[model samples]
Target: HHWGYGKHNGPEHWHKDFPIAKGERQSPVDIDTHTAKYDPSLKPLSVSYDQATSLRILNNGHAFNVEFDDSQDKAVLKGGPLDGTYRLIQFHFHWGSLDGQGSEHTVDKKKYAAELHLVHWNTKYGDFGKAVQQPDGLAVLGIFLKVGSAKPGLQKVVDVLDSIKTKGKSADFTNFDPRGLLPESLDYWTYPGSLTTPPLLECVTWIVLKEPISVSSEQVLKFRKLNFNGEGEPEELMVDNWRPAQPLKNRQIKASFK
Candidate 1:
């Protein structure tokens, strides 16, 4: 009865409970760079994370998320397809069992090792809960992680994995600035879409960066070590936690650059 990445309970079977999974603006679409039209009107995205408000990190039976205090917007994403400022709430990753493939969003049908989604809420909405139901409620910034050299930014997160190996386990992770995890170039492809997980609400403006941040293959192994089940339960390694690419339908994915 639970929704998970398992064969029977995974994304394919989610429609039984959440019919919006078959809706018009679904997420994790393949980005055809050649087909995506470049839009000059789309403003350059400005991500300011100078203030670190990271509260804790935990494994939530799905993916490990670094929660932040979005009470007053210490970190905010502006411009791009967003009309108002979006406050950063948390950031999480979706990955595969191996280094070759795992990203939720693909480019020309080519997949990356992982994908990072920084979840944020529009200030125009009263709160995250209220905003989540609105079409323009959330703005998720997606950053692809390609396996290569050691990613210093991710090392901090990787180091803490052993402490929270099971679902529901959490630890205080303070003063960590997520800005370091961002890829150098801000150029991106964007479109209207839904959350990649349950509820699959169509309330996100996805800004997926064109350039990916390089991560070492060694880090990938640590991420998969986290268990999908909590303590005392049978251990199921949390890998392949990404959703499959959905139908683009009539949606137009716009690129910020040529």
Candidate 2:
């Protein structure tokens, strides 16, 4: 039942070229927020080494959720896009069933076929669990993927992805730092939006980067391995777990750039 945007698997079901399938907004599309859109509320963040936390893995079957055990004040932001200290929590990914493409969001009408969600929470309000339920209580750092040079930034997580290569499957790891997965640039675009998932509540402050990360062909395959095959079963592997794009609904998106 976990369906999202894919090629024939996801977005093809939407509009031709999948408007929101590519980078259009600070969200589901490729939006160039690097202009006057920049605001203090969406400024770059700084992290002291001491604030890092150990990684925790969760097998929700939709995507591989890599979470942290401690609060990260450095990772938290305030009075900008979101209104709290969103501690560094976990980051997972979304992909298609086969490997061609199946992510929820797109870039300039050019869907990556895959996307990653770095989920964080506002400690200023509450913990990640509680914050997710409140609007303006959480922030998500999103990165888009393309097939090219092996993303050195993601090798560690990719290795672990193979361990869980199936629906309802997961593994354990220690000394894991989710920070390693961050792209080179800490710069990003900020906006007020809702979760791409059910409950579809509007309360997320999203930070989408201008840069697109590279993942080798093999790395992309690792994501497809998450398939459970869903043969005559209730769940047919996990394909397109990302949610469809929601309307702007009078919401103003703010970017933090020139």
Candidate 3:
């Protein structure tokens, strides 16, 4: 069965197809701020973008994602919990039908209007496919999106939603640097975790920023306009496209700031 956020094939039913959904160090766990140990050893995260790297933006049925070049020397993210650089291969967003419910990871049980996930694969592992198998394979930089004034950084992507309004629809999207979407502070909560989607491999070193970027309510309306339904398929809006927080198990969450 195709795993989706719908009632039939949602997160609760993911275990049937991918048992790793219940595996140790699963991602999108709630960050208990008071509980997170402040680690001085954590370094500031870094990303080196080419400004011409981002290619296509598409609706992959599950969510809308902007694909990037998978080469090791391009769009690399380093520092923080990583020993080396991880190449950013793809990035996407998760949101809900309503503003208060889209973010996957929560802060003291607080959900943001939405969340942005920049998925990077470990360069030592070669490619995304090979990297997925390594324990320290992926480094995901998660940014929380709170509804407020329009953030100019996101408008470029938001303006193109109509072009890729249906599942499998893709269009050329370039000249975009994701760094602009980040908050002023690089402070974050990091931990051992996995992908929030299917396969759910426990390979991600998730770094979630403490400060959230602002997005106007009208901007979010454009996101809601995108559809999960493919052409000729029944109409279905791509909403509530986030996985709820999984168990923390025995993993420790570390904060870069006090």
Candidate 4:
């Protein structure tokens, strides 16, 4: 059975094949700021990126990912809620077919146009695949995207969508700093959750930013033109690739700022 954001293979049906989808600590949970506990001890997040370490971008049949060379400590995230340095691995996005509805995580029931996830693996773990199985192994920084002014740095990424319109297609990408995509405020909400997609491993330490970055309506729509099918198959537009927010269960959402 295939897993996708469609009717039969979407999030609701994920539990059928991957029981972890229904497990505690599921991701994209609704973040109610009023109920979030403000932790005074939470340190400001430190992000450093060596643009040259950015290698290429690819469509993995799930989302378009900008993969970085994590072989060294080129791009790294430290402090915040993380116990150790987490090396940057890849960054991907999720969006809807239309405006006003796409972000995986919502704030007080408000959904944005899209969401960006910068995934990283802890240095303690030998590799990303192995880090994904431990509680303190993976850290994902989530930034919400809204429709408005065109993001200057993002244009470079959007410009390449035409080259990789179909699934499994890729393009060389370099000298792009993922930090350019972040909002000015580093304040964020933290929680324990799983990957939004299957196998839905509950090993992620989610750090969701409070402020959202803006993108032009046209720029936001460019993602919808991407095809989920490969070159030999019938073309299908890729949109609404976001997963609905899951239950918070017994977890507490912590905030770095008031």
Candidate 5:
């Protein structure tokens, strides 16, 4: 079996299946902004997303992902500690059962209501699977979501949750600009980290935004209703899918703005 966030198959036991889960440069590390160095040379994040590329949203037994048509370069991310154009593959989230905490990467030990990950693969690698094994193959844009104002863009995503409540379930979701969910500032913290899932490949270049997008408490609760199991199986709530923070080791997190 693969892995999951449960007492039996959770992150604590992933190291048995994927040794790299305990390797250096593991992801979801706590970001201590007070100590992070400001890198003046880091370029501003450049994002261009085509609404046409938004194809479908599915519950993958782990998290709900809004997949894009990555066959073409319709959606791409450049700059912001990336070497080449990274094509957008899919966007997903991790959230808590409750409203106060859920994000994978915390800011100084404080967890946000949820976290969003825009997964992309470098054009140099040709494909996302290949990119996942290379040091500089993947670039993830991490956006935190806090409980506050209602985010209309997020509601667009939340509205589809009911249709995709069970694993393997999906709905046609297209012509939606994923960028509409991002915060006002593109300033971010960049560092080398691994995927927070099994195989835990240490290839992702994490660009976590400094500001979090706001969502209403009710809107945030809608995500918790998703099931980890498919239809006919025992229903299991998909919440607190976030992996706990890992040790920083000897990595230097660079900031785009001072």
Candidate 6:
């Protein structure tokens, strides 16, 4: 059905491996501030997080994920713009070739060095995995991490990273509250999108923050040390693990603040 694009490398190459890829939804769009309708309050989310929960780990070749099941925490969305109770699922990250420009959500086409995605599901719907097909089923809270200063909320992840120093190794972490790493403000830009990875579902509502958090260069270098443990042979190093941008179908972005 598709025979136009070139060989492996460019965006067109995706369809070659996964035939259904080109048609799927994707994200990390460039927010053109000049053309975008500006709203000052769309930078913070007024929600409270409570209590402890289980933090599970998945050594999914890409990045280390510490997921939590926050069914009890009633994360009330304020600002009157996006008002809904969101169930926090888990958060993960994305990096690049070096210590600069690896994030997906671009600001006026300017990409960040790294990014953190705190995935949440709309409680009005069902479970996260099941809600993947619904437009309003997913709420991905994005935070940009730049090089500098110590990241206050990333201590636990840093400790865990030290344990799984190599690839294909993961350890379970209990009693970890994800709320700590989240940005102080819930002000975010919302839009229709899809998963950044395989089986890319277009049913995602992205809430990317206007403000970015800072992390030291050392912290970033440490993250680059993860190795994909190959069987028999020595573990290979994992570098430049990021997928290119996807096509923006018929979609519009909206931002909120109070």
**In terms of TM-score, which candidate is strongest?**
1
Q: What is the TM-score of each candidate against the true structure?
A: 0.99, 0.75, 0.97, 0.98, 0.97, 0.83
Candidate 2 lDDT score relative to the true structure? 0.60
Could you tell me the TM-score of candidate 5? Answer: 0.97
Q: Please give the distance, in angstroms, between residue 227's alpha carbon in candidate 2 and its true position after superposition.
A: 2.4
What's every prediction's RMSD, in angstroms?
A: 0.7, 5.6, 1.0, 1.0, 1.0, 4.3
Among all candidates shown, the one with the greatest lDDT:
1
lDDT of 6 by residue, 109-132 (tens): 777778888777767766777778
| Number of clashing residue pairs, candidate 4 | 0
lDDT tens per residue, model 2, 21-133: 33222234335333225566454464333455555565664577776665446444344455435666667787765545655555444567577887777776666667766
Question: Of 5 and 6, which scores higher on lDDT?
Answer: 5
Q: Whole-model Cα lDDT per candidate?
A: 0.93, 0.60, 0.90, 0.91, 0.91, 0.66
Clashes of each: 0, 25, 1, 0, 0, 10
Q: Which ten residues in a row have the lowest lDDT in candidate 4?
A: 44-53
How far is 202's C-alpha from truth in model 2 (Å)? 1.7
Q: List where candidate 2 sits over 4 angstroms from the true fold.
A: 1-36, 40-42, 47-50, 71-84, 97-100, 228-237
The lDDT ranking, best first, is 1, 5, 4, 3, 6, 2
Name the weakest run of 10 consecutive residues (lDDT summed) in model 2.
17-26
Query: What's the TM for model 2?
Result: 0.75
Write one digit per residue (lDDT tens) for candidate 4, span 1-258. Answer: 599988878888989899988888999899998999999999878888754388899988888999999998888989899898999999999999888899999999999999999999998988998999898889999999999999998999999999999889999998887777988899999999989998899899999999999999989879888988888888778998999999999999999998
Candidate 5: residue 98 Cα off by (Å): 1.2
Considering only N, C-alpha and C atoms within 3 Å, which residue pairs clash in candidate 3?
Answer: 96-240
The residue pairs found clashing in candidate 4 are none
Clashes in model 5: which pairs?
A: none
Expressed as tens digits, the lDDT of each residue in 102-203 for candidate 5 is: 999999999998999999999998988889889998999999999999998888898889999999999999887897899999999999999998889999
Q: TM-score of the candidate numbered 1?
A: 0.99
